[PDB]
Amino acid sequence: STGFLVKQRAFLKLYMITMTEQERLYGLKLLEVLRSEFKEIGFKPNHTEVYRSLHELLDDGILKQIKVKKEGAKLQEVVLYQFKDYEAAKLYKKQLKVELDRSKKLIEKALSDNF
Amino acid sequence: RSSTGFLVKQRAFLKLYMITMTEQERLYGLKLLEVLRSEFKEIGFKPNHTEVYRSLHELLDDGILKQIKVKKEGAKLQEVVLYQFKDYEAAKLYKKQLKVELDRSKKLIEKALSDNF
DNA sequence: CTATGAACATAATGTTCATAG
DNA sequence: CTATGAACATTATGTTCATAG
């Protein structure tokens, strides 16, 4: 893949993985949390990208689905996420550190030569 | 609705590099490619030739640069297409955009790198 | 070989519609 | 309305081929 910058889905997948570590999340939650979290910097990911990233982590057997009901005040069906293979997660999280690390390096090298 | 505001595209990354190298040297596709291929090899980014040739032809169609069909040799006789500035303000302006781009891009990586690890 | 470029190919990610609380 | 998707569309890019020096 010509060794360029970290793909978007990898960038999300990383975020899902970490947020599963702390809370229980589903698609539209993570999206809105991210949408907010970045708004300033200016990155505004779409929903279908999130749902793609998620289903990969499924097919990769890192995570698994549960069809629960998060009420609050209503009675809505919502697909929540938990770890299937948490070693698998740990491993991928480490790869993504490496990825981000290069990604930083490139940006900082470009940013150094050209300006 | 945007290009969702994520990381800098590859072609921008190259276009940037062409623009700066034109400032300093005369360059053509295969030269810039090999220079970049080397320059990054450690970090691990190995761009291909057709990506380079795309980036170049944009800068053309954008009227930043223009072709110069010459024969830089040494011990040969061989056509290479060097580029020079067509509209150098146009360049300056784009280079500034790309600073902005790179600046966000850093911000994102550093933010992701902060939260998740 | 180097070099350029078209043509073809698919990968990554955006947009719209279907369908269920 | 939210939430999940699937379907459809396009752009951003990798792979290979036709030329020529």
Swiss-Prot record, chain A:
Task: List the Gene Ontology MF annotations in alphabetical order.
Answer: DNA binding
Cross-referenced InterPro entries: RTP, WH-like_DNA-bd_sf, WH_DNA-bd_sf
**DNA-binding: present as a keyword of the record?**
yes
Disulfide bonds, which pairs? none
SUPFAM superfamilies linked to this entry: Winged helix' DNA-binding domain
The record's section on Pfam families has: RTP
Q: Which domain of life is it from?
A: Bacteria
Q: What keywords are annotated for this sequence in UniProt?
A: DNA-binding
Gene Ontology BP annotations:
DNA replication termination
The record's note on quaternary structure and interaction partners says: Homodimer.
Q: What does this protein do?
A: Plays a role in DNA replication and termination (fork arrest mechanism). Two dimers of rtp bind to the two inverted repeat regions (IRI and IRII) present in the termination site. The binding of each dimer is centered on an 8 bp direct repeat.
The entry's protein name is: Replication termination protein
